[PDB]
Amino acid sequence: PGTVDKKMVEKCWKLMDKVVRLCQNPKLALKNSPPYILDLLPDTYQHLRTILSRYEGKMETLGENEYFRVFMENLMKKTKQTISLFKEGKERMYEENSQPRRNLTKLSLIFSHMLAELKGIFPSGLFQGDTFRITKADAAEFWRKAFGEKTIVPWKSFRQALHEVHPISSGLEAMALKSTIDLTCNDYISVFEFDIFTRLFQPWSSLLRNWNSLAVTHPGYMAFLTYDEVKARLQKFIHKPGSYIFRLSCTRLGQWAIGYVTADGNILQTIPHNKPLFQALIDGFREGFYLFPDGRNQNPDLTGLCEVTQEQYELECEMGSTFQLCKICAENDKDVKIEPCGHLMCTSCLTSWQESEGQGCPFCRCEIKGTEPI
Numbered sequence: 374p375g376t377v378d379k380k381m382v383e384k385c386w387k388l389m390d391k392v393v394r395l396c397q398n399p400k401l402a403l404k405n406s407p408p409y410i411l412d413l414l415p416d417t418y419q420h421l422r423t424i425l426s427r428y429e430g431k432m433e434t435l436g437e438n439e440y441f442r443v444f445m446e447n448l449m450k451k452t453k454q455t456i457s458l459f460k461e462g463k464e465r466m467y468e469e470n471s472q473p474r475r476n477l478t479k480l481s482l483i484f485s486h487m488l489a490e491l492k493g494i495f496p497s498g499l500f501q502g503d504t505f506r507i508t509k510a511d512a513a514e515f516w517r518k519a520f521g522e523k524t525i526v527p528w529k530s531f532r533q534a535l536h537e538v539h540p541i542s543s544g545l546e547a548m549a550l551k552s553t554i555d556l557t558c559n560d561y562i563s564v565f566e567f568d569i570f571t572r573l574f575q576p577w578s579s580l581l582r583n584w585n586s587l588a589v590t591h592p593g594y595m596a597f598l599t600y601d602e603v604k605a606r607l608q609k610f611i612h613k614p615g616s617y618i619f620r621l622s623c624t625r626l627g628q629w630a631i632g633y634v635t636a637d638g639n640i641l642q643t644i645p646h647n648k649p650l651f652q653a654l655i656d657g658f659r660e661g662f663y664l665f666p667d668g669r670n671q672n673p674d675l676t677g678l679c680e681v682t683q684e685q686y687e688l689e690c691e692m693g694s695t696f697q698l699c700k701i702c703a704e705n706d707k708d709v710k711i712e713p714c715g716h717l718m719c720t721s722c723l724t725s726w727q728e729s730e731g732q733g734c735p736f737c738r739c740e741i742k743g744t745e746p747i
């Protein structure tokens with residue numbers, strides 16, 4: 374990734390301007406709900422101006438900073454990808470539920486994560502990547518031992534280092550993990566992304582089993598939603614007290630929020646504090662609040678996560694080995710992803726479901742907007 378100079382910054386601002394103008398189109402009728410691309414790109418522009426200001430008469434130093442170089446390459450690639458999406462999408466961009474339009478939401482989330490990361494690494498415009506404080510102590514010790522004060526690490530190197538303490542036992546597991554951690558979708562892991570991941574999937578001692586059981590195999594997991602989208606989803610279960618879902622929030626990375634239907638006709642949400650999510654969900658099940666994930670009658674049993682020992686390493690190795698298998702047949706490897714639910718399976722099981730007249734996704738019955746080969 375090349376040195377950042379005045380010309381490159383100029384080209385990025387023009388590319389951002391084009392994306393903003395494409396997204397102002399009244400026919401898209403974007404609601405200002407997060408991630409709101411019409412605020413994010415102006416806000417990213419503004420924070421870059423703050424950086425450039427702090428580095429006035431020091432552009433040669435800023436322009437060589439590795440994080441900054443990688444960020445500006447990604448900003449240019451992501452804006453070009455968004456412009457390309459409109460060009461190829463044509464009138465489908467105006468269909469609220471088209472895949473092109475859902476792809477715009479995905480890019481908008483990425484722009485949101487990129488701005489959060491930039492603000493975290495350049496608070497007030499000054500590079501502070503090398504003094505970034507990782508929240509969880511074990512995760513912080515891991516990063517320092519493997520990487521020192523580095524702000525970003527190529528995925529290939531991050532994987533090899535993490536594997537030494539938390540085995541990544543299969544290629545498919547690695548791809549799923551990368552999609553979870555690499556928020557900015559650029560094949561680098563920053564200290565900021567690592568901080569987020571290790572807060573979400575604490576405790577460190579069972580990191581990857583926590584991730585699998587919360588983000589892969591749990592029907593209550595909604596990934597990034599707004600609170601209005603959570604309420605909209607649970608309102609369908611307003612007459613089933615104990616129905617619950619849990620989500621990430623693009624405006625507050627590193628935290629979970631659990632929405633649930635009460636016994637009195639209300640929907641509330643709780644942000645768990647000083648408690649891993651799985652313990653929050655065990656407690657809430659026992660207490661009668663979190664009974665029916667996404668309104669389903671069956672709730673996962675997370676107590677196997679209760680207690681890096683040698684035993685943890687072996688449990689994670691086994692989970693990672695089984696990860697690649699399609700869980701409908703338990704025979705073929707996963708090789709297709711359903712959109713928009715994101716569930717993975719083999720194409721044999723998808724076909725069999727469809728040939729039997731089965732509707733929507735074989736796991737969750739969500740309508741299939743498209744599929745993507747793995």
Ligand code: NA
Nearest residue numbers: 555557559561
């Ligand atoms: Na990244």
Ligand SMILES: [Zn+2]
Nearest residue numbers: 699702719722
């Ligand atoms: Zn299968």
Ligand SMILES: [Zn+2]
Nearest residue numbers: 714716734737
């Ligand atoms: Zn599904």
